[PDB]
UniProtKB/TrEMBL annotation:
Pfam family of the protein (one): Bac_rhodopsin
Top-level taxon in the UniProt lineage: Bacteria
Protein name: Bacteriorhodopsin
GO cellular component terms attached to this protein's record: membrane
Location of N-formylmethionine modifications: M1
Length: 216
C-alpha cells in the first residue's frame, strides 16, 4: 500500500486546494455577517493543502511518520470547532466556547501525539489515548448540546454539521487503536487521508450551506 498511500497524498493536496478555492469563491454568495465561518473553512482546507504537500515531499524523501499529521491537526481541529461556533454563537457565549473547545481540542491532539510517539501498546500509548478520548467525548457531547436551541432550517443545517463531525471523526480514534489488534499500520494512513478530505472539505461545504440558510 506504499504507492497507494503516496498517491492519496497527492489526491488530498488537489482535494484540499479544490475545497479552498471553492469556499473562497462561494463566500460572496452569503451576507457579510455570515461569511466568517466560510473564510475559516477555506483557511482550514488551505492549511491542510499546505501540509499534504509537506507530507508528500516527506514521503518521497523516505522520512515520513504518522506524527507529521499532528502539526496539521493541532491548528485545524481547533479551527474546525471555531467555524461551527462561528455559525451557532455570538458575543460572550462565542468567546467562552471558542476558548474552551479550542483548549480541549489542543489537549486532545497533544495527548494523541504523546501516545503516537511511543511504542504501540505502551503505557504512554494508553495514557495518550485515554486523555484524548476523554476530551473527544467531552467535545462531541458539547457539540450535541449545541443544536438544542436552533429551530427550522437552521436546525436541519446544523444537524448536518453535527453529524459529519460525530460520524466522520470516529475514524481518528479507531485508526489510533487498530495497530494493537493487528497489522493495521498501512491502512491507517490510507484511511486518515481519505477522512481528512471528507471531513475538512465536507465541513466547509456544510458551514457554507448553513451560511446560505442564515442569509436566506
Ligand atoms: C483499500 C482502501 C479502501 C477505502 C474505501 C473508502 C473508505 C473511506 C472512508 C472514510 C471515513 C470517513 C467517512 C465519513 C462519512 C460521514 C458522512 C456523514 O455523516 O455525512 C453527514 C452529512 O450530514 C451528510 O449530508
Ligand atoms: C497563514 C495565512 C497567511 C499567509 C498565506 C500564504 C499563502 C501560501 C501558502 C503556501 C504556499 C506554498 C507551499 C509550499 C509547500 C512546500 C512543501 O512542503 O514542499
Ligand atoms: C450518514 C449521514 C446521515 C447521518 C447519520 C448520523 C445520524 C445520527 O447520528 O443521529 C443521531 C441522532 O441525532 C440522535 O438523536
Ligand atoms: C483535520 C482532521 C481532523 C478532523 C482530525 C481529528 C483528530 C482527532 C479527532 C483525533 C483524536 C484522537 C483520539 C480521540 C484518540 C487517539 C488520539 C487521537 C489524536 C488520534
Ligand atoms: C479508554 C476510555 C477513554 C475515555 C474515558 C473517559 C470518558 C470521559 C467522558 C467525558
Ligand atoms: C470507520 C467507521 C466509523 C463508523 C461509521 C458509522 C456510520 C453510522 C451511520 C449512522 C447510523 C445511525 C447512528
Amino acid at each position: 500500500m506504499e504507492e497507494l498511500t503516496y498517491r492519496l497524498f497527492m489526491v488530498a493536496t488537489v482535494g484540499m486546494l479544490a475545497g479552498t478555492v471553492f469556499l473562497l469563491a462561494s463566500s460572496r454568495e452569503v451576507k457579510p455577517e455570515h461569511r466568517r465561518g466560510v473564510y475559516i473553512s477555506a483557511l482550514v482546507c488551505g492549511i491542510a493543502w499546505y501540509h499534504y504537500q509537506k507530507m508528500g515531499a516527506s514521503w518521497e524523501s523516505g522520512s515520513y511518520d504518522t506524527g507529521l499529521r499532528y502539526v496539521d491537526w493541532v491548528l485545524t481541529v481547533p479551527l474546525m470547532f471555531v467555524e461551527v461556533l462561528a455559525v451557532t454563537r455570538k458575543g460572550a457565549a462565542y468567546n467562552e466556547a471558542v476558548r474552551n473547545w479550542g483548549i480541549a481540542a489542543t489537549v486532545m491532539i497533544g495527548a494523541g501525539y504523546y501516545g503516537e510517539t511511543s511504542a504501540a501498546g505502551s503505557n504512554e500509548y494508553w495514557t495518550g489515548f485515554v486523555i484524548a478520548m476523554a476530551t473527544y467525548v467531552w467535545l462531541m457531547r458539547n457539540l450535541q448540546a449545541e443544536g438544542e436551541g436552533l429551530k427550522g432550517d437552521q436546525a436541519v443545517a446544523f444537524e448536518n454539521i453535527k453529524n459529519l463531525i460525530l460520524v466522520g471523526w470516529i475514524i481518528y480514534p479507531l485508526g489510533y487503536i487498530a495497530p494493537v489488534v493487528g497489522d493495521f499500520d498501512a491502512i491507517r494512513e490510507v484511511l486518515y487521508t481519505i477522512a481528512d478530505i471528507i471531513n475538512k472539505v465536507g465541513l466547509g461545504v456544510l458551514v457554507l450551506q448553513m451560511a446560505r440558510v442564515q442569509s436566506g
